[PDB]
């Protein structure tokens, strides 16, 4: 559940991608709370979250999109420690991949 931000002009902003096993997955913007964002920014040494950005703001990813969501409380040190839960019914397309801007 290793996270990275991809596609931004700086390391601390970009489209969210999180590794599971040997593949990376993006995260639908229907599925990602400000607390998951928070935890992500922290885990990445990027300060605290400023914004979640919709609509593949940093471009869209390709490949898998996470089918479970990270229901973080907010103070977890890693997304790994956040409880997970099923995505809502249907599927998302890459056009709704989520991104973040962390401060700092």
Author numbering: -1 to 0, 795 to 896
Could you pull the original sentences from the published paper?
Infection by its etiological agent, PRRS virus (PRRSV), shows a highly restricted tropism of host cells and has been demonstrated to be mediated by an essential scavenger receptor (SR) CD163. CD163 fifth SR cysteine-rich domain (SRCR5) is further proven to play a crucial role during viral infection. In the current study, we prepared recombinant monkey CD163 (moCD163) SRCR5 and human CD163-like homolog (hCD163L1) SRCR8, and determined their crystal structures. After comparison with the previously reported crystal structure of porcine CD163 (pCD163) SRCR5, these structures showed almost identical structural folds but significantly different surface electrostatic potentials.
MoCD163 SRCR5 was comprised of two antiparallel β-sheets (β1-4, β7 and β5-6) and three helices (a single α-helix α2 and two 310-helices α1, α3), whereas hCD163L1 SRCR8 contained two antiparallel β-sheets (β1-4, β7 and β5-6) and two helices (a single α-helix α1 and a 310-helix α2). A close comparison of moCD163 SRCR5 or hCD163L1 SRCR8 with pCD163 SRCR5 revealed that they shared almost identical structural folds (RMSD = 0.355 Å for 79 matching Cα atoms between moCD163 SRCR5 and pCD163 SRCR5, RMSD = 0.249 Å for 95 matching Cα atoms between hCD163L1 SRCR8 and pCD163 SRCR5). Especially, certain regions with the opposed charge were clearly observed, where the acidic residues were replaced by the basic ones.
